[PDB]
């Protein structure tokens, strides 16, 4: 019938030609229109193995978003190895749109429909499709935004070849809103989050981590250090690069005590000088646009790392993670794999 295979996919989207927004422009020139009536075929009685940590669709998605950003962003200066490149830097229109990934003739995409599938191993409920669901290429660290939710339980995704894992992806079954604003100094911003809603979800995440890690006490602590892009919740809002301090989000005492309810206000900064997530160096952008800058997003997942080097009798320590944007694509492509007919 079929075998595991890799091939060059193509992309589809609902992008609009009249729009100056850069994802639309890229998609208009790089993708075809979506299928109005997509087809899904259940594979009666098939058990298939998946491995989200060995999925060439992830590399392919990465190539796309790199190409997208490299065509779309206009930094004033680019510092890339050994060079300094200067260019015009007009402000752009920026808001990610869903992209579907589709297989060419002779191939199909298998999809895992098990509700508590963790991304690796056997799947009992399998269907075949021509295209993935629409996936927004949101680039962020620590918190996964505007993505999909787990259908049933909270899910912990991690490769299990070793206890020395890299990223641990938490997939939430309930989204939590994050309201980030630069009011109308000019680079000071803040993110507002409903504290009672967040601490409820984070307590559930904690109990799932406990379940996963031999029932030990779960402790959060801040990021070890390194680039601001990973020590902070980093993301792009309306073209502007935001850096938000999340220490208040990972507050162990709020799992009852006082002051844990009500609005959580994270301090944020807009930065012109960034380390490129593409890993190629640094870029400088122009000062923030005037007016009220605002992005409201779903938190749909959390990127974590687990401290490996300290004695653990009764506890495990986790820190917010991210920076490798392939983990972002993994959080959405985990249920898919390409096979050849």
């Amino acid at each position, epitope marked *: 019938v079929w075998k595991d295979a890799d091939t060059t996919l193509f992309c589809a989207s609902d992008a609009k030609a009249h729009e100056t927004e850069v994802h639309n422009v890229w998609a208009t020139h790089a993708c075809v229109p979506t299928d109005p009536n997509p087809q899904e075929i259940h594979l009666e009685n098939v058990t298939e193995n998946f491995n989200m*940590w060995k999925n060439n669709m992830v590399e392919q998605m990465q190539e796309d978003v790199i190409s997208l950003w490299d065509q779309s962003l206009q930094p004033c200066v680019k510092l890339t*190895g050994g060079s300094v490149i200067k260019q015009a830097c007009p402000k752009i229109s920026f808001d990610p749109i869903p992209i579907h990934y589709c297989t060419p003739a002779g191939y199909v995409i298998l999809k895992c429909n098990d509700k508590n599938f963790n991304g690796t191993g056997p799947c009992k409920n399998v269907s075949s499709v021509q295209c993935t669901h629409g996936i927004k290429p949101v680039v962020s660290t620590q918190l996964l935004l505007n993505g999909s939710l787990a259908e049933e339980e909270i899910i912990i995704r991690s490769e299990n070849l*070793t206890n020395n894992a*890299k990223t641990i992806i938490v997939h939430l079954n309930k989204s939590v809103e994050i309201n980030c604003t630069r009011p109308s100094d000019i680079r000071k911003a803040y993110c507002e989050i409903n504290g009672t809603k967040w601490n409820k979800v984070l307590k559930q995440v904690t109990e799932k981590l406990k379940e996963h890690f031999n029932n030990k006490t779960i402790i959060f602590q801040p990021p*070890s*250090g390194g*680039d601001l892009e990973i020590t902070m919740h980093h993301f792009n809002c309306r073209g502007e690069f935001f850096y938000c301090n999340t220490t208040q989000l990972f507050n162990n005492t709020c799992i009852t005590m006082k002051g844990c309810n009500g609005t959580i206000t994270l301090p944020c900064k807009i930065k012109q000088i960034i380390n490129m997530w593409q890993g190629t160096g640094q870029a400088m952008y122009a000062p923030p646009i005037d007016g009220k800058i605002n992005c409201v997003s779903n938190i749909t997942g959390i990127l974590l790392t687990r401290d490996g080097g300290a004695n653990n009798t009764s506890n495990e320590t986790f820190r917010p993670g991210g920076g490798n944007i392939k983990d972002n694509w993994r959080s959405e492509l985990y249920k898919y794999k390409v096979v050849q007919i």
Partner: antibody
Amino acid sequence: QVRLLQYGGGVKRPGASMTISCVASGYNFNDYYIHWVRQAPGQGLELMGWIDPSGGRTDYAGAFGDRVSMYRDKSMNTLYMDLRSLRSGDTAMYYCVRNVGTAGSLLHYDHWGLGVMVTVSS
Amino acid sequence: EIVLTQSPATLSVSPGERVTLSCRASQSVRNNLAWYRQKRGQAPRLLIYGASTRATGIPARFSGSGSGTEFTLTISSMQSEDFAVYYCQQYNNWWTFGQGTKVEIKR
């Protein structure tokens, strides 16, 4: 053609802090973690901690809790390790080592630097 | 805090002869075990990873095997360059090393 060239060896004074370093080449600097491993005379190899050069995340051995820092200059393919509050027990060979990984895992070591000798005394 | 025990600490073997080295873990490490060699004035060198896979450039006289908590490194026929110190390493939980086995020349 991987190479990890090391610097910073020599005599250090007790109570002081030292910085040693490692210059990497022959591969994509962003794609491999680097581990710092030391061997004290008459003792076994011991991992001090690792750094992921892509973003600078680190993870340290608890036995070196407060005293160690690892960081890097990406644009120079250069890795640094600080060790503070030096004592005589810190007299050791210090190695820069690159670590093989997968998408989600950290595995064995595939290239060691020649190492640097540190001697702590007054 | 996974402890690797390499005993005996010293092995005396005549050139051209067979040697088997032992590594015992205090706890299961799956097959996440590697072997390194260290000669005088040289950096440690990877020989074997994943318990039984030879690294690039390593001749076929080197062999690794093992399950659970007991692993071996065997050299089918000892060469001149083979007399050295050998370390096992697990990377199942953090990274830890055995204390080493020195293989010396028997005369």
